[PDB]
Design an enzyme around this catalytic site. Structure first.
Site, PDB file in Angstrom:
ATOM      1  N   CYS A 101       0.881  -1.558  -0.236  1.00 42.88           N
ATOM      2  CA  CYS A 101      -0.093  -0.182  -0.373  1.00 42.88           C
ATOM      3  C   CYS A 101       0.563   1.041   0.136  1.00 42.88           C
ATOM      4  CB  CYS A 101      -0.957   0.044   1.556  1.00 42.88           C
ATOM      5  SG  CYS A 101      -0.795  -1.604   2.453  1.00 42.88           S
ATOM      6  N   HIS A 119      -2.796   6.202   4.765  1.00 37.67           N
ATOM      7  CA  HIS A 119      -1.699   6.361   4.620  1.00 37.67           C
ATOM      8  C   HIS A 119      -1.445   8.000   3.484  1.00 37.67           C
ATOM      9  CE1 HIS A 119      -1.131   2.742   6.124  1.00 37.67           C
ATOM     10  NE2 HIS A 119      -0.172   2.192   4.898  1.00 37.67           N
TER      11      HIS A 119
END
Lengths: 354, 354, 354, 354
Positions: free
Chosen positions: C148, C243
């Protein structure tokens, strides 16, 4: 002239408090840092110092050593904040080897021959050690301190039970993370959340309070402890240190909050009369502001930081019911600080030699 | 065919729930987004969307308009989540101008002719609107919803009081930040901390519960409400939405937690009977696991997300005391959702024209 | 013609996104929830639903079944978000049983015959399946998606690299907790703290970006990938999802930030062209406000929530350097969503059953 | 031999550090606590003690006094951490009445005749005072300390710029909440979120760094400061104290991270050579662990807690680029400790007489 302490589990959230406080103590030295996983490494390299200040200068380069009583000829006292299951047999093995053992672990807490000690509340219970030694046939002994959660309630409730016909206490806790150790509580359980701890934790909190109260020397005789209703609903949130507790307390008869509040202000026990070094001037601090105590600002209060249980919000609910809240530093008074104070009381009573 | 709603304070933390929910409503549309500070600006450009999903697409482009009756000739219903002190006189201005006003503000909550309304608890108190109109000489009206914190308690307590000799409830709250609005609570108040709200907030929570319970139609007549003892100890911590409460509940006679739980599981009132669109199939959801409900997991629970009070931990404490916990989504059930449900009831009873 | 899919680690933080999204998918159904510890039990009773909404109605009473390629006749696809070390040999078993496997785990990301797939960037790489089947002598296949964190940088950097003489990217990440899974990051690591992930994590992020960038069909050929300088400094904080990354990007020659902005705005790929169901309209969303994107408010952006990388703060730094920030939903686009997108592409190009 | 200090805004997050530090200072006494809204009250009863330990016993009882030069006859030094817009005119009023004023406010930071002082980097610029007094026709003076955030980059960057051919630094900050004061950052901006501070804050950070760097005495001459490229992307998160920064630093020629590391390890300035009481032994502490520094564990590092910038993660990116991280305690080095250190310097060079 000093005594040399070993601290088991020395890199843990409780062992760090033994290290911080013993580093400042007048006669108990932190001389032997025991562990397992990091044996041979320097303490300051491996430790998570999740407390005030920094690792003490003189401790930082000490290697962690094996948890092995055969290596500890030089040690006078064992402090043992070990995890449940692991604790019981390790402590027996130390006691059997002739050490005085101060445990913060649950394994021995209800042994009828092992003292479950809050020094301001039931100091007379240390004379259980006589029977312990004789019946267990060992030169040493084990003494336990109670669950920190139970202590944040038992200290005020003990002061009250002593002088008032208290017949119940219905408690809500909001506990900090450090109580669960490390790795302990997963971060995903307390971000934007509250984690109830469950019936098992609720039941063990009450059990321990009942034992502490069953051992308090009272000025009234009603009601009998067996007629006392205790209840707890326990939680953790994302606070680092400090267990915050709301208590509703019931009495068998008309009781004014102002009277109770004064009892709490005035509370002291043998540790204060004896002026033991780690005994706070006020083991209960009472606050008068309607938004105090707060965890952040009050967990390190008192002449000895962390050693006082801070109470506030004393209020009449009805003629037979009062509300108060209490804050305990869970690794200081609730664990290491209480255990050091136990040791001073035991030295003072003759149970640990100079 | 549509009824046109104005949302006052539309950008605020409650205003956004009006917008999210009415966006999905089968017959009440958010037709007028009111404010003050950002009048002239596109809604989606300025709103802090601190709720699930995204700003509704058909709404983002709508401009914020003045909070002024003479501008709102096409509007059918006013929802008013305005701050205390401001709200009182604005609400009266609207009612005087012929508007139905459904307020989540404290200002009119104790007005004797103003419904303090939890549809499932005291739906019949809407008939106060008829005398309100004669009394105040106005064609509109004001209906208020209670403090979200009061609803968290009063909903399960009202269900119990209805069928049981309850003579006390002693409450601890752990409330979310959205309740305080924006800017609301300073970050430094809740990081590594618990914020007590104080005696005024505790007292106001209790006073609101007393008004609500005094309007429940009970199936037993004992004890009298004047004989019921309530207490609250209120706090905020760093959760975004969802007020969690621990309730210790006493009864005047022996009482089964098992029966009380069945009573909470099966609880329903008029909104479920009349099948109002925002009425949840289970206004109370009862959980069985000893670590539920949890804020994050349960705050959006049920067929209408956020409309049900989620209860758990039902336990016998003694023969006359039980422990439970409840979770309420404070801006959904606790404010906007309750308001919209209120509006559906008022339409169904002819108080707001079709 | 509904495809039936198996979800390995279905109770986990990534498996829950497969369960959420495939519940709404037009032809890929979640029909087999595979676990180990909770096999036999109902999905709804054990799963930690740490995402938006609630467990889908029709999934909740599905039993968790064992993870074994001989019990899945009914099954057409494997989605495997399994932990490293464990996942490598498991996924091989499934492809060596005929199944097509879309993996979110690290184990095969660096096999030269295993596609490491971002469908908007290197969709042609799926043809590695042909000579993968050949050289492994198995009927199924493995496709993996990237870490990710690496997707959050490579999606904008790939769109940049394809069209600009990019010679450098210098990245700081501020990642959420969900990426570590559960129990994952201990709470004490992120309360009032920032947790660095270390050199191994920084180096693995860069290695993946480099693989991806190497596989991008470019419109320019300067500089060569081997002369591109990449660095990352990676951290976690107490956010649940999303994130957030800050990128300083350099170029071999004068390059305007407004041109790069347009390139990122306008960015489309083969998934968009084909109109795959899980393909966002805007794989990169570009924000213009100097305080956006924000984790809380932008992680669920876009027509397919969590499928778009949200970019903002495009600013000229000097003639050959620009600053931008990016936000990726780590369990959606960064894992389960990218995977479902991989599944739709592979069906389209006729690599998956029907 | 003592100097009596006046602390303006004494109850503020920067005030409490002046109180804490000065309470232990060998020669500067915190003699006058100035404020506005709490004048007449005792310091300890009103102050928000959001730092280590408790309010010093001898300060607690001190009454807060008006901010009025006419009342301060016996004061020798004014420390002024007042909010922007208020600070400017108040600080000029103090200097025109004859006082030396050390300000932590932004208002005078870019006056040509007002030092913007990091005592380790530009102690010589105190000579600006002389033409300040001539030009302004005042007998006192104002000195300022820079934005804490700018000091966290300027201290390591100056140490590099002094000795190496540094041609750019590209910074990402992750700042604490205390830097915004109280009430400062609303709690909803930072729970499960990162708050970017925007272009104005990014630009002002860089502007302050440029000024400080332009006054550093260098051993090398390339490149000119006017040709150095700086960029900052700044954020706040839910930490209490401590600003963490990631810096990518580039050089006009090949430069080994091992050498830059030795230079940072060895950094010292005039305050160390002059042995000023508040001068840390190591103004930069260099850590070797790939997960250090961490906010919680290092913001209080050093022989003088919070006075050292802690640097870590030194790694080569390419021949001409390195990566490092820095952590500054924003209210100690970044504000009050830095001010006290300036005052000591001013005392030592004869600008303030004992």
């Amino acid at each position: 002239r000093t005594l040399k302490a070993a601290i088991l589990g020395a890199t843990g959230l409780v062992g760090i408090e033994y290290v911080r406080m013993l580093s400042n103590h007048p006669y108990i030295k932190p001389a032997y840092l025991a562990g397992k996983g990091s044996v041979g490494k320097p303490y300051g390299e491996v430790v998570r110092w999740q407390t005030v200040g920094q690792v003490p200068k003189e401790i930082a380069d000490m290697e962690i050593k094996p948890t092995d009583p055969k290596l500890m000829d030089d040690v006078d006292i064992i402090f043992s904040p070990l995890p449940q299951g692991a604790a019981g047999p390790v402590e027996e093995q130390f006691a059997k080897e002739g050490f005085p053992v101060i445990s913060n672990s649950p394994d021995h807490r209800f042994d009828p021959d092992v003292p479950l000690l809050v020094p301001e509340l039931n100091p007379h219970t240390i004379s259980l050690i006589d029977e312990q030694r004789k019946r267990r046939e060992w030169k040493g002994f084990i003494v336990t301190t109670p669950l920190c959660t139970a202590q944040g309630a038992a200290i005020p409730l003990g002061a009250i039970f002593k002088d008032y016909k208290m017949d119940g206490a219905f408690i809500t806790t909001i506990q900090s993370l450090s109580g669960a150790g490390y790795p302990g509580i997963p971060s995903l359980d307390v971000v934007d959340n509250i984690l109830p701890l469950g019936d098992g934790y609720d039941a063990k909190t009450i059990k321990e309070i009942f034992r502490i109260l069953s051992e308090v020397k009272r000025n009234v005789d009603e009601p009998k402890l067996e007629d006392v209703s205790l209840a707890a609903t326990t939680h953790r949130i994302a606070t680092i240190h400090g267990h915050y507790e709301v208590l509703y307390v019931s009495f068998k008869e008309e009781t004014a909050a102002e009277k109770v509040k004064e009892t709490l202000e005035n509370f002291r026990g043998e540790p204060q009369d004896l002026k033991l070094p780690t005994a706070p001037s006020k083991p209960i601090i009472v606050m008068n502001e309607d938004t105090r105590p707060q965890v952040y600002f009050d967990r390190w209060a008192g002449d000895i930081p962390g050693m006082s249980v801070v109470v506030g919000r004393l209020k009449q609910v009805n003629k037979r019911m009062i509300r108060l809240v209490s804050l305990i530093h869970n690794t200081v008074r609730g664990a290491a600080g209480g255990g050091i104070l136990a040791a001073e009381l035991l030295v003072e009573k003759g149970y640990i030699e100079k």
